[PDB]
Amino acid sequence: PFTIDSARGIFPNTLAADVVPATIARFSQLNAEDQLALIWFAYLEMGKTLTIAAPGAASMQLAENALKEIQAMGPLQQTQAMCDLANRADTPLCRTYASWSPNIKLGFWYRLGELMEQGFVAPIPAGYQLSANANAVLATIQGLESGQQITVLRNAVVDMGFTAGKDGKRIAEPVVPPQDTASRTKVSIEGVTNATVLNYMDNLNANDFDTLIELFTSDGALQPPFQRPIVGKENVLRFFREECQNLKLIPERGVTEPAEDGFTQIKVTGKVQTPWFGGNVGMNIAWRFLLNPEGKIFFVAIDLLASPKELLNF
Ligand SMILES: CC1=C(/C=C/C(C)=C/C=C/C(C)=C/C=C/C=C(C)/C=C/C=C(C)/C=C/C2=C(C)C(=O)CCC2(C)C)C(C)(C)CCC1=O
Numbered sequence: 001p002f003t004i005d006s007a008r009g010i011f012p013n014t015l016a017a018d019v020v021p022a023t024i025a026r027f028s029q030l031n032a033e034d035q036l037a038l039i040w041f042a043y044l045e046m047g048k049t050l051t052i053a054a055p056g057a058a059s060m061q062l063a064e065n066a067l068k069e070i071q072a073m074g075p076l077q078q079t080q081a082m083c084d085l086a087n088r089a090d091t092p093l094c095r096t097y098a099s100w101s102p103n104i105k106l107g108f109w110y111r112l113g114e115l116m117e118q119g120f121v122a123p124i125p126a127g128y129q130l131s132a133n134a135n136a137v138l139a140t141i142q143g144l145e146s147g148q149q150i151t152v153l154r155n156a157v158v159d160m161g162f163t164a165g166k167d168g169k170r171i172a173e174p175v176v177p178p179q180d181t182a183s184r185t186k187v188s189i190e191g192v193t194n195a196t197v198l199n200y201m202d203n204l205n206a207n208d209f210d211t212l213i214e215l216f217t218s219d220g221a222l223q224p225p226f227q228r229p230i231v232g233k234e235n236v237l238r239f240f241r242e243e244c245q246n247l248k249l250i251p252e253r254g255v256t257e258p259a260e261d262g263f264t265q266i267k268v269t270g271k272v273q274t275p276w277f278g279g280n281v282g283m284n285i286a287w288r289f290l291l292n293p294e295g296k297i298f299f300v301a302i303d304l305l306a307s308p309k310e311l312l313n314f
């Protein structure tokens with residue numbers, strides 16, 4: 001209950017899927033052309049059984065100029081531009097890309113994937129063979145659960161490009177209006193009646209970010225899977241609005257324990273769906289809450305779990 005960084009240690013039994021950042025670190029070592037080929041390979045195979053949802057119209061508008069610029073290049077330049085993004089080179093295209101929210105980056109690559117499939121953007125060279133390190137990285141990816149697979153792909157996409165400056169322009173999709181109160185569903189969590197946890201889940205499922213943020217302490221933090229804590233209401237609300245639209249949280253069961261100084265620690269396990277895959281991918285998730293004596297959220301961590309065997313009382 002003293003520091004955000006120490007609260008990171010609550011529920012230390014929770015086995016997170018650290019194969020995801022491990023695999024991202026291996027991927028990030030590879031030659032840029034192998035990075036592009038590997039994801040092409042993974043994308044094609046995954047597309048045999050899982051269809052990515054189409055990017056939103058606003059997103060496509062925001063990426064359109066950059067996409068047109070690439071589409072106007074000769075093939076060798078197209079390949080160089082994509083390598084620039086993978087290498088995190090400092091170029092105008094890489095700076096534009098870095099200014100984008102994850103969803104806009106994902107929609108940019110969604111479009112390039114379609115154009116490569118159609119032959120209008122320089123495809124991976126025919127008969128391309130991955131490097132020794134890259135073939136093993138792909139093998140690991142293809143052995144993971146789909147929820148882990150899609151998280152590796154997102155993290156590879158978000159990592160590309162070049163950030164120059166701390167207070168650089170941030171481009172994101174417009175904020176969706178919250179769900180009308182009448183049509184809202186309420187979660188049920190075995191073992192957990194805590195109103196702050198239930199209101200957390202219900203407000204996020206309704207895209208009601210202004211209500212959600214009011215659950216937090218001023219200095220409170222939210223820790224997304226495999227990322228550092230996002231600290232204080234402005235940064236956490238920013239994150240909700242830019243990155244947390246149209247999720248479906250399906251918490252199942254939890255446990256509630258006292259913590260030092262009248263705090264309460266609560267662990268919930270369940271599933272989450274991203275709007276990119278809808279009901280076809282259910283990620284296995286834990287939430288770890290540290291609530292102050294008044295019930296506000298001092299800290300919440302969201303963990304991608306190593307296996308369904310990490311869900312409480314499987
Ligand atoms: C790149 C590339 C390509 C294309 C690649 C493409 C098109 C790849 C596309 C990949 C896509 C669309 C991946 C989407 C992933 C989404 C995830 C993991 C969302 C998780 C959300 C969670 C867990 C949120 C949970 C949350 C909960 C519960 C909270 O309680 C609080 C909020 C929080 C957010 C934390 C080509 C194919 C063209 C080849 C070349 C190449 O490189």
Ligand SMILES: [Cl-]
Nearest residue numbers: 243274275276
């Ligand atoms: Cl998402």
